[PDB]
Each structure stands twice: as C-alpha cells, then as structure tokens.
Amino acid sequence: HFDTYLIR
Amino acid sequence: PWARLWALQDGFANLECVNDNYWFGRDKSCEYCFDEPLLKRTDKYRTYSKKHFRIFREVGPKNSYIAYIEDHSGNGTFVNTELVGKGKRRPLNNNSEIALSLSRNKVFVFFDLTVD
Numbered sequence A: 001h002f003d004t005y006l007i008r
Numbered sequence B: 001p002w003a004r005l006w007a008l009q010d011g012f013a014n015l016e017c018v019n020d021n022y023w024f025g026r027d028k029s030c031e032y033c034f035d036e037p038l039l040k041r042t043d044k045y046r047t048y049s050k051k052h053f054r055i056f057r058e059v060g061p062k063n064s065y066i067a068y069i070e071d072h073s074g075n076g077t078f079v080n081t082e083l084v085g086k087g088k089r090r091p092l093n094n095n096s097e098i099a100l101s102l103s104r105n106k107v108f109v110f111f112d113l114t115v116d
Helices: B037-041
Strands: B003-007 B015-017 B021-025 B053-059 B065-071 B077-079 B089-091 B096-100 B106-112
Touching (some): B065 B077, B065 B106
Antiparallel strands (some): B003 B015, B021 B053, B065 B089, B077 B096, B096 B106
C-alpha cells in the first residue's frame, strides 16, 4: 500500500 | 453486537461490533478495510493510514466491559472533534462522532448497544 499523504 | 458504526459518508460501510476488536485502515489485515472503489478516488482516502485506528471492548478494572478507541494514524483520529493522538487511547461513549485526518471530517457515529 502507498504511503499516507501527510497533511501537515 | 455490543456496538454499531453508522457511516456518514459515501464510500464507507456500516459496521456491527460483534467481536472484541476491530482494525480500521487501508491495509488488508484490517477487519474493516477502507477499500470501496468509489472511495479510492476521493483524495481524502489518500490521507487515511494503512492502520488508522481500532475499536475494542475490554473488561476494565471495575470488572465491567469498556469501549475504547485507539489511534494509530499519521494524520489523526478525532472523537467529537478532539484529537486522540498517535499511539494514544481513549474511552468511546455512545453517540461519539469519529473524524479522520481533519477534525471535522466525520466518517462514523458510534452507538453503544449496551443500554439499548
């Protein structure tokens, strides 16, 4: 699974 | 079924809490897997973690079941707007709203079927 887009 | 999860957004399924423990996240090893095709196109899906959070029921100190939410996400799991915090855990009461990544991004309502 792709790495999580961190929104900060 | 001691608890039920009501999905407030398209792309998520409702859930009846039967077992003592449930993982929610993108990973396939989650009892509840964020995978509805419709959802994988929403961009917010991209901010959810492989292992985002878990809900479990446990015999507390008073020798009585207690519900908990434990957060494991990178962007955050929120209960009634309040960040649970990575690695942290918190009791989950009836009518609790769960938001992911953003504190207002409601996804689930938790209903405790213990009083019902």
